[PDB]
């Protein structure tokens, strides 16, 4: 039990992966609010 504590204190990639995936998707969602898709601008006030 004393070695678990060292090996961790010094491995949680499966938990890091699901956090990263969700953040990478939420950022791609917002970064799409600045594409034209074939229009004159990306702003409705323009």
């Amino acid at each position: 039990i004393g070695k678990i504590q060292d090996s961790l204190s010094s491995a949680l990639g499966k938990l890091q992966d699901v956090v990263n995936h969700n953040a990478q998707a939420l950022n791609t969602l917002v970064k799409q609010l600045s594409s034209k898709f074939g229009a004159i601008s990306s702003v409705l006030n323009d």
Partner: protein, 48 residues
């Protein structure tokens, strides 16, 4: 409207420091979140 920047939100006194040629600041994901008042030249945050 700050000399062209049109928006909506609450304005608040800031504590960031632009460089003395930068007008407004942006966030990651690219949304305006700070401005500089042209007349008095002070930085103000923009919260929704």
């Amino acid at each position: 409207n700050f000399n062209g920047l049109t928006g909506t939100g609450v304005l608040t006194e800031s504590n960031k420091k632009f460089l003395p040629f930068q007008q407004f600041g942006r966030d990651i994901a690219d949304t305006t979140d700070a401005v500089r008042d042209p007349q008095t030249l002070e930085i103000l945050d923009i919260t929704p």
